[PDB]
Design a protein around this nucleic acid. Structure first.
Length: 88
RNA sequence: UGCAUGU
């Protein structure tokens, strides 16, 4: 064998507080700690209201999505959907 | 800024 059968890939992370960043998601998903990369969608005003993170393959990453999908932070529920990449 | 599948 020459390839990782379980490799992570990326994950849509919505309705987040507009004070969020890339390091904030990588640390907050970092409680579970399966992040390869992060990708906030950003505008000149703030976070644009969602990010992407590189995270999802195993059942523990599914469980982790299902936990942070409804996590109240700064008085706000995050909504962590699975992803397109990127055409639909 | 509450923009909704990508900086």
């Amino acid at each position: 064998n020459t390839e990782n059968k379980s490799q992570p890939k990326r994950l849509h992370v919505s309705n987040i507080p507009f004070r969020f960043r890339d390091p904030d998601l990588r640390q907050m998903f970092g409680q579970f700690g399966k992040i390869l990369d992060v990708e906030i969608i950003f505008n000149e005003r703030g976070s644009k209201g969602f990010g992407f993170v590189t995270f999802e393959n195993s059942a523990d990453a599914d469980r982790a999505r299902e936990k942070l999908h409804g996590t109240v932070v700064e008085g706000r529920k995050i909504e962590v959907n699975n992803a397109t990449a990127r055409v639909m």
